[PDB]
Amino acid sequence: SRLVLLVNPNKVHPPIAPYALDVLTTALEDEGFEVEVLDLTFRRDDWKTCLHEYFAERSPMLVGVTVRNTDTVYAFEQRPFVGEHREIITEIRRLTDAPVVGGGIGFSTMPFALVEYFGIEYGVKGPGEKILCELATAISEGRDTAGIPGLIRNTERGAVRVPPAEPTGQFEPRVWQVDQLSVYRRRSGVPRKVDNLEYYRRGGLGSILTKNGCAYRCSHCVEPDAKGTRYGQRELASVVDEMESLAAQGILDQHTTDSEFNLSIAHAKNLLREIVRRRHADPDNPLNRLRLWVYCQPSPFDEEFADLLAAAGCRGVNVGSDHIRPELLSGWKVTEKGGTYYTFEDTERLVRLCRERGILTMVEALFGMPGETPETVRACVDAFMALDATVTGFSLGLRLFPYTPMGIEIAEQCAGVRTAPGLQSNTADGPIVLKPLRMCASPAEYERQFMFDEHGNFRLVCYFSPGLLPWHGAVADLWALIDPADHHRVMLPTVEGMSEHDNNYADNPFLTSLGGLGYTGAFWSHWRGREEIMRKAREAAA
Ligand code: B12
Ligand SMILES: CN(CC[C@H](N)C(=O)O)C[C@H]1O[C@@H](n2cnc3c(N)ncnc32)[C@H](O)[C@@H]1O
Ligand SMILES: N[C@@H](Cc1c[nH]c2ccccc12)C(=O)O
Ligand code: SF4
Structure with missing residues (x-):
């Protein structure tokens, strides 16, 4: 048998297409395997039925489960997803004896713990397209898996990793794990494949990866470890091919899935140049209707980069400025050598350049890192609010992870x-x-x-x-800092009983509604007019 099953257990709405499964599907099929996807995102109330029917009909020799999120990563909420993932995996092992392999970004923040907690045979840390192909080949050919580099194996004493060596595999480059050449095929309307158009119609977004990894080492962030500490860049032609494929299907709002789009800046600029070139070469090219949404750090973001974003079709930039105080940013937003890499001028310039070009902006602030006091909070709020960014998101509290x-x-x-x-x-x-x-x-x-x-x-x-002790009292003080005239343009930890204002997209009811109302783009791009969108929604409901 050469049949591999891939399951998406992500139940969070507004729905986000499980990009990982498209990457793995391309790699597996290019290796000669048959791949079927069971996507439970739209089967929340009857996923067991979806599993019962599939396993009675099919006999995959390897089952893969993608664990995107361990939890919401919102300090005030502390809502885990791994229990619900474990419940789905337990039903799977009930229905088949085929081995189960785990993967995912959130999975890669704690892969050994999750392998033992889920009780599954295998796991992968970081990008999985190459390791999964070797695992599927070993299983299919009846071979030993003890020599598969990078594979985490669940032995009777616990999870143990084959060296690609740190027994945890922490902070490796992981570039060798990345498929840097292929076009990741993104399908729509195909049974037992990821349905990208369904996600676009219901959630509002498509996605595109240009490079894996992050070379920095910000003290809060799981990505350098869980993704890789060196950049594995994809072929630009393959990236733009995939973007053109999505645009052709009508998926015009595309969110980059890089750790930071503007890091490894030459590759990002060369990517934008290729998009502009194809846009100019043929007016019928669907990239002419591209609406690109990106993640950025405050630096590097120069005028040339801003011009290229505007010309390529960029519509919004989310910048993780995170704070203004150097006392707080020191030792926090740092490179691998331990030095800071931006100042507040960089955020000011980023916001200005995007304004000059009609590009919306969201500025992130993360409160509660070591050194934070009420006066450090007020200083960041006053300075950030004066940026006049489209959205200013204030989060409070840090979720801890083993490899941050x-x-x-x-x-x-x-x-x-x-x-x-x-x-x-x-x-x-x-x-x-x-x-x-x-x-x-x-x-x-x-x-x-x-x-x-x-x-x-x-x-x-x-x-x-x-x-921040006299941690809910800080929330009330934070709300008092925002002028009522500016309430509409901020995300804030929500006081008692109010509607959700939190910088949290996981099962946010207002954001869940936008798809059915025909809105698209980044989930923050319509935050400002939510009052009008709600008024308009009840106008057509009556
Ligand atoms: C872009 C992005 C978003 C966008 C999504 C845009 C879109 N249309 O796709 C938005 C803003 C919507 C978003 C929302 C959220 N996100 Co987000 N997001 C990301 C980001 C930067 C990229 C995700 C991505 O698509 N990567 C590219 C894909 C292809 O890679 P991958 O999924 O990791 O898959 C590879 C490997 O993991 C591996 N693998 C994956 N699955 C499997 C399965 C098997 C069997 C195997 C063997 C291997 C394997 O192989 C794959 C191919 O290389 C990631 C961090 C990152 N650099 O990945 C954070 C990140 C994943 N998100 C995170 C969070 C917390 C959230 C939210 C819960 C926030 C919130 N409270 O609302 C929501 C969840 C939304 C949802 N529905 O699930 C956290 C997860 C932390 C954790 N411990 O789980 C991250 C890590 C951010 C961070 N630095 O903390 N996100
Ligand atoms: C959007 N982030 C930068 C882009 C990055 N690639 C990502 O997806 O996290 C920065 C924001 O992520 C949030 N964040 C990241 N890691 C954590 C964490 N461990 N706990 C809480 N918030 C976090 C914070 O709000 C921070 O301002
Ligand atoms: N603020 C992020 C989404 C987000 C909310 N909570 C998070 C926690 C961790 C990482 C990201 C997030 C964005 O606008 O894109
Ligand atoms: S640059 Fe962004 S992705 Fe990289 S470690 Fe810092 S916050 Fe995380």
Whole structure:
């Protein structure tokens, strides 16, 4: 048999197409395998029926599950998804004896812990298209898997990784894991394949990857480890081919899925040049209606980059400025060498250049990192609000993960013998004592503590700066900083009982409605006029 099943357990709406499965499908099929996708995003109330019918009819020899999100990563909410993922995986193993392999960005933040927690045979950390093809080949040919480089295997004593070596595989480049040549085929209306048009009609977005990895080391961010610490760039022609394929299907709003679009800047500029060239070469090319949405850091973002974004069809930029105070940004928004890489001028210039070219902007602020006080919060709010960005998103509190510098540093402070100031969890019974990796018997133990307590219960560990103590009181003080005239243009942690204003797209009811109302683009691009969109919605409901 050469049949591989790939399952999407993501239930979050507004729906986001599981891009990962399209990458894996292309790689597998190019290797001569047959691939079928079971997408449960639109089968929330009857996914068991979807599983029952499939496994009675088909016999895949390997089942793959993509775990995009471990949780919402919203410190005030602490809503896990891995329990619901485990429930789906448990139903799968009930229905078949074929091995199960796990993967995903969120999966790669704690792959050893999840392999043991899900109780599955295999897992991959980072990009999986090359490792999965070798795994499927080994299973199909009846071969041993003990020599598959990069494969995490679930032994009877626990999850153990084949070296590609850090036993955790932390902070590797992972460029060798990336398929840098192929066009990732994006299909629509095809049974048992990812239905990209369905996601566009119902959620509002398409997606495009230009490069894997991030070379920086921001203390809050899981991506350098979970994705890779060096850039694996794709062929530009293959990227633009895929974008043209999406545009041809009518998927005009495309969100880049790079860690940061403007990092590895020469490749991003050469990408925009190729898009502009094809747009100019033929007016019928559907890229002429492209609406590109991107992630950026405040630097590098120069006038040439801004001109290219405008000409290629960029419609909005989300910039993770995160803060203004150098005392807070130091040791936080840093490169691998430990130095900062932007100032507030860079965000000011980014917002100005996008304004001059009719490109919308969202500026991110993350409150509660070490050093944060009420006066540091007020300083960031006053300065950020004066940028006149389209949307200004204020988040408060940090979710800790085993392979972020904050996760490691706070585990260092605990040293396995005491709790650390600022540690928080909504489900904690007493002191949260974390253990550094070197004090743990296995990767699984070091990784699991950031999500579970000793008794196996969910205990999603967060950090809140003790300087924000007299952490809900800070929310009321943060709301007071925003002028009522500016309420419409901010995202904020929501006070008691109010409608959702949070910078949180996971099951946001207003954002869930936009698809049915025909709105598209980044989920923040219509935040400003939500009052009018709601008024208009009840006008056609009557
Ligand atoms: C773009 C983006 C978004 C966009 C999506 C745009 C779109 N139309 O696709 C928006 C803004 C909507 C968004 C929303 C959210 N996101 Co987001 N987002 C990203 C980002 C930057 C790229 C995701 C992506 O598509 N990558 C490209 C795909 C192809 O790669 P991949 O999924 O990782 O897949 C590869 C590997 O993981 C592997 N793999 C994957 N699955 C499998 C399966 C198997 C079996 C195997 C073997 C291998 C394997 O192989 C794949 C091919 O190389 C990621 C970080 C990142 N750099 O990936 C964050 C990220 C995934 N998002 C994150 C979060 C928290 C969210 C939200 C929950 C935020 C919120 N509270 O609303 C929501 C969830 C929305 C949803 N419906 O699921 C977190 C996840 C953290 C965690 N621990 O899980 C990340 C890591 C951001 C961060 N730095 O913390 N997101
Ligand atoms: C959008 N981010 C930059 C783009 C990045 N590629 C990503 O998808 O996270 C920055 C924002 O992500 C959020 N964020 C990232 N990691 C965490 C985390 N561990 N806890 C809380 N918020 C986080 C913060 O709001 C931060 O301002
Ligand atoms: N603010 C992000 C989405 C988001 C919300 N909460 C998050 C937590 C972690 C990472 C991203 C997010 C955006 O506008 O695109
Ligand atoms: S915040 Fe952006 S630049 Fe910093 S590590 Fe994460 S993805 Fe890279």
